[PDB]
Amino acid sequence: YRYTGKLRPHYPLMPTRPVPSYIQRPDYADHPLGMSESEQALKGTSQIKLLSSEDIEGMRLVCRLAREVLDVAAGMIKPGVTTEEIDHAVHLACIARNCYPSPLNYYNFPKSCCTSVNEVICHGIPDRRPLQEGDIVNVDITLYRNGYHGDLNETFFVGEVDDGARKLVQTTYECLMQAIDAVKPGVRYRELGNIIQKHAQANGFSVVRSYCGHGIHKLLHTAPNVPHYAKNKAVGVMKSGHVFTIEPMICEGGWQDETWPDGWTAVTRDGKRSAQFEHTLLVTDTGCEILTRRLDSARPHFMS
Ligand SMILES: [Co+2]
Ligand SMILES: [Co+2]
Ligand code: NA
């Protein structure tokens, strides 16, 4: 394998962390290949759940808890901390809130969150590498509580970063918020990619194509499929009670991605940096509820 950049995996990984049996587990947790029966049984549909009041409550709860866990991780971002150390703290924080870390054994994914550094686009595997001054790192938190998943991520600065990092991360956040600001009943899912790419391109950045936002609730990913690039073919129309993510991945260079031999880590083919932000959203009649929002600050962590 030829690496696309400077980053390398730092093995071995610490042994898999167990989750006490009293925490309720999603179906894939105990599947030998981490496949999800319940996702399989809805594999290939494009019908979008309209959430019940019970569902809405379940999604508010897990999404609030997911935010608390991201906030734990955010508190640890500094030079010298390894992504495995972050993942360990995330693992314990999920358990402390009676949640299962959704990534863990999802299709045999080995860790309890995704940590994506620099040229990693998404799905980086926490490992023994200490963060370096100048890095950018995304932590993507998914929790499972009482049958529901919630999903968010932020990109963070590790110490002082260069002007390119500041611009990439600011622009990515702007793309997310512009997309969120358009969400409301009657809007086509395919429209969000138009808004995102327009802002990305205006700032000299490209938009990852191979990864999309997604429905989420009792399934970790389901309809709708939500591309972040212009003139996509996404199917469907937003309706009150829809819940899905918007999670744009923006790149300094080209949009092309490839996967490491680990089968998870997605990287820019050119080795240039990529940043991401994600919220889980619930479509309401005036617009949407940002289920994963910060409650105690107006702004994401990187603006500190
Ligand atoms: Co997501
Ligand atoms: Co996510
Ligand atoms: Na990155």
Domain CATH number, residue 230 = 3.90.230.10
Q: Residue 186 to residues 1, 242, 284, 285: CA-CA distances in angstroms?
A: 46, 11, 11, 10
Cα of 289 to ligand 1 centre, how many Å?
Answer: 16
Q: Which residues contact 158 (CB under 8 A, 6 or more apart)?
A: 77, 78, 79, 131, 132, 133, 134, 135, 136, 137
Give residue for tokens 């980086």: 124
Q: How far is the CA of 247 from the centre of ligand 1 (A)?
A: 6
- Domain containing 47 equals 1-304
Domain count, the chain: 1
Rounded CA separation 175/195 (Å): 7
Nearest to 282 by CA among 52, 26, 41: 52
Taking the centre of ligand 1 as the mean of its atom positions, its distance from the CA of residue 72, in whole angstroms, is: 19
Ligand nearest to the CA of 152: 2
Ligand 1 centroid to residue 279 C-alpha, Å = 8
Say which experimental method was used.
Answer: X-ray
Sign for the CA dihedral angle at 269, 272, 273, 274 comes to negative
Phi, psi angle pair for 20, to nearest 5° = -50, 145
Q: What is the resolution of this structure in A?
A: 1.8
CA 185 to CA 171: how far, in whole Å?
A: 26
| Structure-token match 């693992």, residue found | 91
Q: What is the DSSP string of 17-79?
A: PP--TTS---GGGGSTT---HHHHTTTT----PPPPHHHHHHHHHHHHHHHHHHHHHHTT-ST
From the CA of 250, the nearest ligand is 3
Tokens of 164: 């390119």
- 210 CA distance to ligand 3 centroid (A)? 15
Cβ atoms within 10 Å of 96's Cβ, excluding its own? 12
Q: Compute, in angstroms, the gap from residue 246 CA to the centroid of ligand 1.
A: 7
